[PDB]
Amino acid sequence: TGALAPAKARMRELATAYARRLPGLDTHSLMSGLDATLTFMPMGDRDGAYDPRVVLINSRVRPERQRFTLAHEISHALLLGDDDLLSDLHDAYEGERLEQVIETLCNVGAAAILMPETLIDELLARFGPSGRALAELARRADVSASSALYALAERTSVPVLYAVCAVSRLEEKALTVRASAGSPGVKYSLRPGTLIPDDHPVAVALETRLPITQESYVPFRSGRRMPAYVDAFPERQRVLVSFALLPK
Amino acid sequence: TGALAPAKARMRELATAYARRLPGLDTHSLMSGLDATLTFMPMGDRDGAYDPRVVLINSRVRPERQRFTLAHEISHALLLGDDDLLSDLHDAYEGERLEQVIETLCNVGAAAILMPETLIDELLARFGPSGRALAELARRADVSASSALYALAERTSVPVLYAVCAVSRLEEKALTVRASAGSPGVKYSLRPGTLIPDDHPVAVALETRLPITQESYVPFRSGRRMPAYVDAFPERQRVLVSFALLPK
Ligand SMILES: [Mn+2]
Ligand SMILES: [Mn+2]
């Protein structure tokens, strides 16, 4: 219900087309088709900046995030390029809502360029709806775990709650859910900052540095333990996990 | 004879070390260890700019040249980093001579990072002292043909005059020698702008778009025809060629 879904489809079309024109999905190739001045400067904590036409990217953030920022700005330009899509958006949204839709479309396009549906479907085929597949997508696409989490969950055909867990400053430091996403049908969500029990398979994966795949529970902050099969892949001081909700 | 040779060795050492620290030789990885603001802006025809600490690269030049420019600035910083090398240079050269030595060392270091000796020796082993090996080095290293030409010629153990030929504005357009280099012992050089005869194998390669390997002559502007075996590889509207001078 809404003009966002058809707009997202058009964004993916434009993004996929620009990608095929690119020699590769390498950061340099993306910069090549930017068609605008791009400046990488240190600037505390921020994904990046847009262009009127000068694009800016923080050099303190990890390269993966800079890649997504660049794809976002490419998608923004691609959007402002197609007059039809822009007219459709302006004939449907206005003010903050239009800005939110544009931002969402830019993020939708960025993922379409960096993470192709083929790659995701192939990885889901080889590794299944698992945290290992999440790790593969993030590495094979050189993207942040959070970005891959949303893309992988969107194309999962089974009830799965993917999650990216890592050590956090909490309130001193502990393993917390950094990001979470559910497959199209999942009716649950994992609060960011949720603490991972030390006895939990995800924590064992971080300590052992070995992939852990066992039946466990979703570590809800309510002390509730929803039965689920957990596939945890440890990587870069972060644990990519898959919570397969089981009917029980 | 001179302090340049030992300086070049130290430059290669520092450059090789920084390269091994890099995750890969991808343009992004090189930018990661720049440790300085980098800005890509259109600016007519120019390889790039140095930093006091902001590096600048022309966006109108091909990506391969931008890669070499980035490696050059990394080598320059690497040079200014090692106090010993800089002291040695200042204890040996001064004024314009020092600037020339620094520039040469920066170019020596840039090639060391982008084109490893292993890669060159491997390609020379599989394809031999040929224009095909020149094409492979330029592609496998994502570097300009001119840069690869000098690196390949430096490690060729046989008398070979490598050359990069392409269509030029001449004085209207014709196939001309864009760049040339000889193996360590070659006692000849090919003038840039030398015209390639239409009957010459190099020209046939450009028209046929097929690799040509036959016995021919070095097309000297003096009408002189020095006997040589010619291996011409056509690629990207440019012909990478190898002139194997034969004793005869
Ligand atoms: Mn934007
Ligand atoms: Mn310099």
Numbering used by the authors:
A (entry chain A), B (entry chain A): 19 to 70, 73 to 191, 201 to 277
The article reads:
A protease-based derepression mechanism in response to DNA damage was characterized in Deinococcus, which is controlled by the specific cleavage of repressor DdrO by metallopeptidase PprI (also called IrrE). In coordination with the transcriptional repressor DdrO, which binds to the radiation/desiccation response motif (RDRM)-containing promoters upstream of DDR genes, the specific cleavage of DdrO by PprI induces the expression of DDR proteins following DNA damage. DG-PprI, which is comprised of 9 α-helices and 8 β-strands, contains three domains: an N-terminal zinc peptidase-like domain (residues 19-135), a helix-turn-helix domain (HTH domain, residues 136-176), and a C-terminal GAF-like domain (residues 177-277). Single-stranded DNA (ssDNA) physically bound to Deinococcus geothermalis PprI (termed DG-PprI for brevity) and stimulated its protease activity in a length-dependent manner.
We first determined the crystal structure of full-length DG-PprI at the resolution of 2.8 Å (Rwork/Rfree=0.247/0.284) in the presence of Mn2+, which is effective for its protease activity. Despite weak electron density in apo structure, a catalytic manganese ion (Mn2+) lies in the active site of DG-PprI, coordinated by the conserved HEXXH motif (HEISH in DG-PprI) of the N-terminal zinc peptidase-like domain. Interestingly, strong electron density was observed on top of the HTH domain of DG-PprI, which is interpreted as the sulfate ion present at 1.7 M in the crystallization reservoir solution. This sulfate ion is located at the positively charged cavity formed by residues from the zinc peptidase-like domain (Arg85) and GAF-like domain (Arg207 and Arg267). Given that HTH motifs are commonly found in DNA binding proteins and sulfate might mimic the chemistry of a phosphate group, we further investigated the possible DNA binding capability of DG-PprI. Moreover, arginine residues forming the sulfate-binding cavity are required for ssDNA binding. While the double mutants (R85A/R207A and R207A/R267A) showed smeared shifted bands, the triple mutant R85A/R207A/R267A totally abolished the ssDNA binding of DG-PprI. In the absence of ssDNA, PprI exhibited limited protease activity in vitro and adopted an open cleavage site with side-by-side dimer formation.
